[PDB]
Design a protein around this ligand. Sequence first.
Ligand SMILES: NC(=O)c1ccc[n+]([C@@H]2O[C@H](COP(=O)([O-])OP(=O)(O)OC[C@H]3O[C@@H](n4cnc5c(N)ncnc54)[C@H](OP(=O)(O)O)[C@@H]3O)[C@@H](O)[C@H]2O)c1
Ligand SMILES: NC(=O)c1ccc[n+]([C@@H]2O[C@H](COP(=O)([O-])OP(=O)(O)OC[C@H]3O[C@@H](n4cnc5c(N)ncnc54)[C@H](OP(=O)(O)O)[C@@H]3O)[C@@H](O)[C@H]2O)c1
Lengths: 410, 408
Amino acid sequence: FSKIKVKQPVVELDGDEMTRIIWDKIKKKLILPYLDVDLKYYDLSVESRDATSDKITQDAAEAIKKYGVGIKCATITPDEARVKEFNLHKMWKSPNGTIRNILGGTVFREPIVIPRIPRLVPRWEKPIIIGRHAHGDQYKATDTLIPGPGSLELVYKPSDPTTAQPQTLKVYDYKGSGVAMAMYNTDESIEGFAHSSFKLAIDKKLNLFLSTKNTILKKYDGRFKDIFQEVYEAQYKSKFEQLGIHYEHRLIDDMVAQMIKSKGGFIMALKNYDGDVQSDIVAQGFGSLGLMTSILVTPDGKTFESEAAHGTVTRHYRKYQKGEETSTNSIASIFAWSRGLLKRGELDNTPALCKFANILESATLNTVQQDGIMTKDLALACGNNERSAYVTTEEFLDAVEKRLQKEIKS
Amino acid sequence: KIKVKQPVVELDGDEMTRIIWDKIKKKLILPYLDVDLKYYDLSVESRDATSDKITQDAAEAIKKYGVGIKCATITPDEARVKEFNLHKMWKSPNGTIRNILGGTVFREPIVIPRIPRLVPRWEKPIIIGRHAHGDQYKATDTLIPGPGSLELVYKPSDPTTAQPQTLKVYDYKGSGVAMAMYNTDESIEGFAHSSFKLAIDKKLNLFLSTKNTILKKYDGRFKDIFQEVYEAQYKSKFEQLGIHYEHRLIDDMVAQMIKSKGGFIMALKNYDGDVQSDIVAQGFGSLGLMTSILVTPDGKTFESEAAHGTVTRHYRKYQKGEETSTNSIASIFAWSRGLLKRGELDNTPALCKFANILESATLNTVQQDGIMTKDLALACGNNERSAYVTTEEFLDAVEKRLQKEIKS
Ligand SMILES: NC(=O)c1ccc[n+]([C@@H]2O[C@H](COP(=O)([O-])OP(=O)(O)OC[C@H]3O[C@@H](n4cnc5c(N)ncnc54)[C@H](OP(=O)(O)O)[C@@H]3O)[C@@H](O)[C@H]2O)c1
Ligand SMILES: NC(=O)c1ccc[n+]([C@@H]2O[C@H](COP(=O)([O-])OP(=O)(O)OC[C@H]3O[C@@H](n4cnc5c(N)ncnc54)[C@H](OP(=O)(O)O)[C@@H]3O)[C@@H](O)[C@H]2O)c1
């Protein structure tokens, strides 16, 4: 059929295991037949990474920065058993972290809602998006064991004693053995977090809430609150008002409670640790990870990386490897493509592309909603594990493919 | 009447909960028990009138006789200081009591089958234990104006038995923020003992959650101490009861928690305990069915109270002569749970029986008689005025049912 010309190159990052499998199928059956796009391919499989000494990972990030918009497949984050499983030169760092830090920007997780599929928190009918500040609180902290009595201090010595002054803060006086830890964060990173959060809220046309425990951590957390407020008043307030959306700081205690009581439909910006823990809570609350997507947004709002929020689905890959039946959800991976192409269409002002992206999504979701064709993970939420309620990994892709063709005739 | 061997320490509170507290004592307690109630008025006024001294006297008394029954109290803050013209912004009475008694607070929701929960699958209590000693809650934080180094420095009292430590935390290339916190093996060990005794008492599985994958030393310490404490005194008891202890990464626990049907205990570090307690409570429904107990390491001192506040919004209406529908179930349980502990300690099976009948009468007023306050009716999808009853009407109903229940 007629192909849509994609003006700017799209960066594609291949992953491994199960997702690598459905990725190739999604491409040939759902993308390549309708678009004339130039894909800058970067293989991020563990095998490819271990070979290039993890260089392709960096090269891929650079590519995304250069062209704007990357579309990524889940990848394996090597650990102990992984190093032996593939005979790696060493436990490489998670490609997700390496790319995220190279591009700057923040990651926002968004669940896809399908009416027909109940949520564990049934009241949730609209997505609750979680943005996580992944810079350096507890994830870059220094912790140790205090052996016995003594004093603990936080000491800061400025590189320039003329403008700033030294700090020597008393933390605690141990009367026995125990534990200690110190962490940091910077104005620069927090500022990017704010910018990335406001731009996504504008794009999504959703209310934005920042959560901290500023009542306790008066300075530390207070810092996040002040920078968001400052960045807001100066560059986004007027834009939030035109759309009818609002920004607001809320105590993590209140936000968290108001969150599970709501019906959803808004964005929560959170600090490293809260974002980590709350993302797992929200995802599970909506249901299957097969419906959790994610988008990386930079402060300048010119660079994006699109990828499913779940992993390589290793357990399903073990079955696949033996020829055993699998029911893996391809929905999130498909949306990695549609959301990435959508951004591609927006930056190049190519409505044609944007239109196709919304059609791919519609075809995908109506397959479940209207036709009732779905994978096991989805059927489980309905209370139907009978091998007649769900369909196989490939059967689902076949269904959406057929549906796309139909909905594409206009 | 039923004779309560040891004295029960009673702390009175403020606003709406103070109102229901007096009606409860007089209608559901005093008529059936011959108990010596050591009374302590912990209202905002009483506290500000004694420079917060009754608070301490109260805790000391709980420490003396064992169990305490407390009414929700007002925690001073900028706003409250102007409202009552408080001399000083007195700190949380719960905190002060917690410090004197040591011990850990466990939040347990009351599940009434007829009343739906927001997380529909939760049909069994999910109890959260909070280590409220001090991580972020006793940390020192500061702003960092610009480029410079940041270090953690430890100097031992006896540089003969311990080595000093000077760890590079970070080199700022720009302005930012810094923070440091601590915890002690002592409190962690206390936190462990209380958790285990509560699991044994409730006969439920116990789970400890941390981020020991990132905070290898700090959180690995909680893990190791709990394990040590577990094997040192509770493993066999757990084995006899058929319950299990386990450490879980917070990421896994929380995901598992929301996917479960409830029925277990989660011991959490200070911060997670705080945030997760609010999630769990809201998942079950009204804060009106939320209870809590303070449990000391030795397992001989308890403080029972509603897990909710003074219900200020409802108090104003009460002030304007307007009708109210405040759920008193949680307050009544504060009495029942406390009295149950009193009996367990005094080996007074009679007191324990009363306690269980008071809880049966209360809950059945809702489950069978269909008499409930507004919060519960709303949870049932009933938004009609005729669907619920007033604060006093509900108490009147429990009172009547209690009399019938006691008959046999
Ligand atoms: N690159 C990334 O973005 C990323 C993110 C996270 C993890 N990972 C990596 O992925 C590998 C495996 O991680 P993991 O053990 O957490 O597996 P996972 O891919 O995170 O999935 C865990 C489980 O969730 C369910 N699930 C996830 N996606 C599904 C889908 N699309 N359809 C149906 N069910 C789905 C399955 O449960 P059932 O087995 O019960 O069906 C699956 O076993 C590891 O190397 C990990 O580091 C990569
Ligand atoms: N002593 C304690 O353990 C304790 C604990 C928490 C707070 N406090 C104190 O309480 C004051 C702040 O209160 P707050 O703003 O947190 O309000 P709250 O007393 O915590 O209750 C907030 C809302 O939850 C619902 N609710 C709570 N208890 C209920 C009940 N028994 N029956 C029916 N509905 C109930 C009501 O919502 P609707 O308005 O929708 O009816 C109520 O307005 C401060 O003095 C604070 O220090 C004390």
